[PDB]
Every structure is written in structure tokens, then in C-alpha cells.
Design an enzyme around this catalytic site. Sequence first.
Site, mmCIF file in Angstrom:
data_model
loop_
_atom_site.group_PDB
_atom_site.id
_atom_site.type_symbol
_atom_site.label_atom_id
_atom_site.label_comp_id
_atom_site.label_asym_id
_atom_site.label_seq_id
_atom_site.Cartn_x
_atom_site.Cartn_y
_atom_site.Cartn_z
ATOM 1 N N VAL A 1 5.070 -4.778 -2.456
ATOM 2 C CA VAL A 1 4.260 -4.250 -1.594
ATOM 3 C C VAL A 1 4.350 -4.415 0.069
ATOM 4 O O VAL A 1 3.805 -4.041 0.472
ATOM 5 C CB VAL A 1 2.688 -4.442 -2.006
ATOM 6 C CG1 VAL A 1 2.279 -3.638 -3.281
ATOM 7 C CG2 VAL A 1 2.295 -5.858 -2.009
ATOM 8 N N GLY A 2 4.971 -5.633 0.102
ATOM 9 C CA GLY A 2 5.202 -6.065 1.487
ATOM 10 C C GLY A 2 6.519 -6.667 1.791
ATOM 11 O O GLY A 2 6.908 -7.077 0.873
ATOM 12 N N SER A 3 6.563 -6.890 3.032
ATOM 13 C CA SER A 3 8.022 -7.552 3.212
ATOM 14 C C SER A 3 7.927 -7.680 4.937
ATOM 15 O O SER A 3 7.134 -7.374 5.604
ATOM 16 C CB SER A 3 9.302 -6.947 2.779
ATOM 17 O OG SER A 3 9.097 -7.039 1.649
ATOM 18 N N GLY A 4 9.014 -8.202 5.550
ATOM 19 C CA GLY A 4 9.274 -8.303 6.773
ATOM 20 C C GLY A 4 9.594 -9.724 6.822
ATOM 21 O O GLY A 4 9.677 -10.744 5.994
ATOM 22 N N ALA A 5 10.019 -10.065 8.236
ATOM 23 C CA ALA A 5 10.769 -11.484 8.464
ATOM 24 C C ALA A 5 9.729 -12.831 8.019
ATOM 25 O O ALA A 5 10.462 -13.749 7.965
ATOM 26 C CB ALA A 5 10.998 -11.453 9.988
ATOM 27 N N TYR A 6 8.671 -12.351 7.748
ATOM 28 C CA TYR A 6 7.751 -13.659 7.248
ATOM 29 C C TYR A 6 8.105 -13.732 5.670
ATOM 30 O O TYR A 6 8.310 -14.880 5.165
ATOM 31 C CB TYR A 6 6.360 -13.329 7.368
ATOM 32 C CG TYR A 6 5.937 -13.340 8.867
ATOM 33 C CD1 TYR A 6 7.160 -13.855 9.648
ATOM 34 C CD2 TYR A 6 4.788 -12.879 9.285
ATOM 35 C CE1 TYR A 6 6.836 -13.800 11.132
ATOM 36 C CE2 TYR A 6 4.610 -12.726 10.788
ATOM 37 C CZ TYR A 6 5.683 -13.376 11.483
ATOM 38 O OH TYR A 6 5.511 -13.753 13.159
ATOM 39 N N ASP B 1 -4.769 -14.335 7.768
ATOM 40 C CA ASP B 1 -3.439 -14.543 8.520
ATOM 41 C C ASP B 1 -3.088 -15.804 9.175
ATOM 42 O O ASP B 1 -2.942 -16.786 8.446
ATOM 43 C CB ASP B 1 -3.239 -13.089 9.150
ATOM 44 C CG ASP B 1 -2.499 -12.352 8.632
ATOM 45 O OD1 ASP B 1 -1.323 -12.459 8.256
ATOM 46 O OD2 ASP B 1 -3.008 -11.192 8.448
#
Length: 340
Positions: free
Chosen positions: A24-29, A162
Site C-alpha cells: 500500500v505504500g512506498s517511497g524513499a523511506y 509521522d
Amino acid sequence: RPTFYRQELTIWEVPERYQNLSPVGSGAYGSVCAAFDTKTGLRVAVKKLSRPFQSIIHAKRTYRELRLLKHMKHENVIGLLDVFTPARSLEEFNDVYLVTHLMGADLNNIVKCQKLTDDHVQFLIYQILRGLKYIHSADIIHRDLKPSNLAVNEDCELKILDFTDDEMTGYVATRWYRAPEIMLNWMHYNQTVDIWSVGCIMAELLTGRTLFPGTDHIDQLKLILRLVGTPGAELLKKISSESARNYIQSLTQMPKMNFANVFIGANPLAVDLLEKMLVLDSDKRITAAQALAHAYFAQYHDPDDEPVADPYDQSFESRDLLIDEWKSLTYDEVISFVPP
């Protein structure tokens, strides 16, 4: 050690309690899967960190996040449900996975779907300040409160979540909630920064409109100064940058606006609270603790159900260490994780 199974969604190796992982999510983190925790019956978010110890900075960042998330134990703040690695020793260690409650929707999403009511606003802001009293008692600063960082469930219960210069240039939500002193680096910041963000969030919930939709830093400053008035001498003394001081000095002095004519028809107790929050000089802002005692929250305020945190030792922030030392502190924190 639980048993781990591996599947490629990237390869995730997770304990078999976590079933039905769905990307459901991803990105450089890090990538994020939604999953079902069979053992707690919770619906969870499993984050596989991207490259956590790729650089002293990334290692230290990994460490900081883990340290922060393991500290937080409060209804209105995200906490860590679980953290793990398939690695059986420090020497094998590379991957960190963090497990948290699968969150429903953030405050923006709520708003897109709904008109809120002063009772909703009352309740939602109460919870943020309740969370922040806790956060601030451990001397943690969120420095980035925004409606996208506030998760609201079907029952209007909320959790604070966050916790780069181009990304803050322009007409961008990344800057609209930022306290002036940090947006322009007027002076060293502290926790009062967050109460400014809360003021901005509250107003927006009351009006349905961004309070300061700046198109850039200077435009946004102008918006702020029109509402709260330009700096007086006391605060000018506290801005350490001569150029900044100079620049403020070039702007025509304007008085504080009448907030009752700005927030037309809002509950006067809300209007009054906004004025206490949105003070240009951080030193004179209301604190979360004090705000929780403001009449505007009489229906929710319970001094014996507004807890403070255990001490958060952040001495590591002052420490220079090699990648592998940061990494080892992170491994240590992984394996000492006591479940909730």
C-alpha cells in the site's frame, strides 16, 4: 524468535503472525504493506525501511525514528506495535520492519468527505493538544504538524503521526502550517512551534480554508503579519539575524486584526483560543497543557486523563558515531523491543 516467511511484494520476510500482506505504500523511506496481525487481530501497517544504514545520516535517522516510535505510549500518538528483522545476529543485520496500526484516513481525507462541526473541531483539537502535552512533556517537538499527519478514525478519534528546501518552496502545504520563526529561521526554535501549527489547523477546520496559503515564504509571511500584526521591538530583539530583522523592519507596521471579524460566526471560545495560539512571539503562546484547560474544551477536559510521558533521553542527537555504531544501537533497540 518467531518463524518468518519470505514473499516478494521487494522480498518481505515477516513473522508468520502477519498475514495477507498487501502493498500500500512506498517511497524513499520504505515500503508499506497493509497486513492482518493474526495474533492481535489488529489491522497493521508494516513498513520495510529503505536502505536504513546507508549513510551515517541514514543510520542515525533510522535510529532516531526507532527511538522515537518506541517511546510513544499515548492514545493520540502513533506507537510502535512491533519491530523486527529476520537477522539472527548483528553481523547478519540489515533490514528493519516497523509495525503500526493501519490507519483509516487523515484529517484532509476526513474533511474531503465531511463538513465538520464545532463539536467535531472541539474534539479533534482537544485530542491534538492532549497528544502534544504528552509529546512536549518528553521534550519532543513534532516540528511538522499538518492535517496529513493526523489520523482520524470513524469515531473522530485521532492520532498524531509521522513526526527538503525545494519541497518547501512555493504554494505548498509543507510550509503553510510552519511557525514563522522556523520558516525564516528567525531564532532557535522550541516546542511552541507546534501550537502555531495547531492554530493553523484549527482555523482551517473552522473555516474550511487554509489559514495562510502562502505562494512562497515571503508571501506567507505577509499573510501572517496582516493577521497577527508586524513584530514589535521585544520580538525583534529576539530575532538573531540582522538581515531578517532588517527585512521585517522594511515592512509597514500593521496592527493585530480583530479575530472575531476574521473568524465570523465562530464560537467565541474558539476565537479566543486561536488568538492565544497564534501569537507571533513564541514565548507568549499558550502551551498545550494550558490550552487543554481553556473553556473551549470544558466538555472534554479531564486533568486526570491527560498524561505526561516518561523522559526521552535524546543525547544521541549530539553524538557523532560511525554508521556501524548507529546500526548497532539500532540492532540493540530492535532486540530489546518489549511488545505492548
